[model samples]
Target: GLKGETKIILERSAKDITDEINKIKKDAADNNVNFAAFTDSETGSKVSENSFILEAKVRATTVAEKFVTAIEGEATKLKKTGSSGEFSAMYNMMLEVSGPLEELGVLRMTKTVTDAAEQHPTTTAEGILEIAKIMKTKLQRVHTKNYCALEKKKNPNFTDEKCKNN
Candidate 1:
């Protein structure tokens, strides 16, 4: 009663579970309010590409097990934001890992984040971290290159006198 939608959302019938899921699916779309959740830097740093875990890291299931466990671990602790809790965990992990990767190497930014955080089930943290290590420098170093490149992603005509060389 006092809990309102949380009560309804949690106590709803099995069929209603699917109903609520679809509702949230479209609810995000309806408002154009997409969620890209974030998590602690600790988790991200542990799964970091560069690590001495080599002596401890191997086996086909090592990383998959690592990621799945971490994901669920964070999910359990997160405040009940429903399915979005998982999404937040993913977002935070990337920021901790790839965020610094871009700042260091990848002159033009090896890859953009939208590629990962996109609402695609195919995306995985393991895959993203692996690819980020295969860094590529595209744009020649120049003033505002980073800013212009980031801006141009959304604004085709985005221009800046400070960004001319490449």
Candidate 2:
């Protein structure tokens, strides 16, 4: 009983966090702003040509870190408020997404993501696309339940079956 409820909470948390990150990405794209270039790092200037992927990656990493930190703190609060069963479920769910937030309960996914980007620094559009897709896919899995829930909330007639199928 508690597990089911806690799972929903975890799903919602994941979705909210991921959605915020996506918004950051969208806003940057819409503005045609190159945050990385704006920083004008030595590496970025050396490239001469535009490194859309690299710039986007750097910007996303920075923004995600801040949002992820706040979300992780929220998750920690949720974990502390529930019963034993709910707590266990929450812990396991957190573990699933724990890589980015390896401080265990502190929710540092942003840090993990930034570190990964720093390591490779995807310079080409193709590379950034591949990396971003992978990140989205991973978050989608975590957010699936919450996404379905939200769809149903928004449209009472929407069936869970249809939502899940999507």
Candidate 3:
């Protein structure tokens, strides 16, 4: 029991994971989003001051989706044509798009085999793992950025680069 690692991992539900995990965390988002989606619905000015969530995510933004589609297109090619060349090619493709993603609205991707996707070749699995790590990192950065932005708006002054530090 003491020496096992996998036991506790699946210990929660042991059947479905995604839904449970999603639902678990899914509870907390309602409040914070009250500010970002802070739009007065119909009743009680349900917008700011920790009131409510905007009903619609609203229509799709601009070519904002283009970035994802671009990467996914190359990714699909990788899926259909699984060769070393394709793997490296897809890696480079992702690398190139990342630059533009930073300037992309809201998404604001901003990665290091981490950095090799720029310089040389990285194989399928190895490159995928490295990229996944970078993805998780950027995800954390995004959350931190939004929270930092919100806090700054409230306080009007703060920056240790700690907010943007990530």
Candidate 4:
């Protein structure tokens, strides 16, 4: 029902629930996540990748656990749209943790054990905080670079024009 500009609430059967879920899953599998849901950014475009809690430079079960917990926390509180059905919402209880450590870090040094060591399942119980610490360090470096650029802009002594040895 439509009352003025808002959609009026109307009671419906449990079947509505199942239908909505099917629609969401079909769209997501065929199109993308955004076809099934909306992001905080509100862009209507399809998701290139699934959103998640943790992205780590190293592969670790702790990383996945951190993501699972974050998803649980958000799902408990947020008001989902008709777009989000039961299973997809539940499945989001974990998300992909991304990193290219094999090509770029000390983790590469221990590559052989990285995957197996992290998935022991026991290590993940307290892994979130550690993963956060690692990510924070890298993000801070980015913040520092931005701050330096801004400071130089404010310092007129640093001219915008290119410098010449002449």
TM-score for each prediction?
A: 0.21, 0.30, 0.36, 0.25
Q: lDDT per residue, candidate 1, 1-166, as tens digits?
A: 2245543432232233224334444544665542111111323222222221111112211222233344433333323224543435344543344332222222223244344334343223344343332221221232234445545556678887766524
Q: Over 4 Å off in model 2, which ranges?
A: 3-6, 35-166
lDDT of each: 0.34, 0.42, 0.39, 0.30
Clashes of 1: 3
Q: Mind sharing the TM-score for model 4? A: 0.25
lDDT of 3 by residue, 35-151 (tens): 234323446322333311211211111232333233334444334225656545544544554443332223433335345456533535454544555555544554454455445
Can you list the residue pairs that collide in candidate 3? Answer: 112-115
| Predicted candidate 4 versus true structure: per-residue lDDT over 58-97, tens digit per residue | 2222332343344334333223212334314333222212
Model 3 scores a TM of 0.36
lDDT of 2 by residue, 1-166 (tens): 3366554655776676556445645676787865344234434122213434333344434433443333334334444335534433433443355543321112134444445456644312233334344355435443443344444545767665533532
In candidate 1, stretches whose alpha carbon ends up further than 4 angstroms from where it belongs are 1-67, 76-90, 98-114, 119-166
Q: Looking at model 2, report the run of 10 residues with the lowest lDDT sum.
A: 100-109
Error of 4 at 106 (Å): 20
lDDT over C-alpha atoms for residue 94 of model 3: 46
Better of 2 and 4 by lDDT: 2
